[PDB]
């Protein structure tokens, strides 16, 4: 979905690591 992908943007962020 489009709203489910929004959470994927954080994976790219340094907070995910």
Distance CA 16, CA 1 (A): 21
Half-sphere exposure of 11 (CA within 13 A, CB side): 5
| Exposure b/e, 1-17, CB count within 10 A at least 16 = b | eeeeeeeeeeeeeeeee
Query: Is residue 16 within 8 Å of 10, Cβ to Cβ?
Result: yes
Distance CA 1, CA 14 (A): 23
Quickly list H helices, 1-17.
2-5, 9-12
Tokens representing residue 13 in the block = 């962020």
* Residue (of 2, 8, 3) closest to 16 by Cα position: 8
Experimental method: NMR
Tokens representing residue 16 in the block = 């995910």
Three-class secondary structure of residue 14 per DSSP? coil
Tokens representing residue 4 in the block = 């489910």
């Amino acid at each position: 979905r489009s709203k489910d992908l929004r959470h994927a943007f954080r994976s790219m962020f340094p907070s995910s690591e």
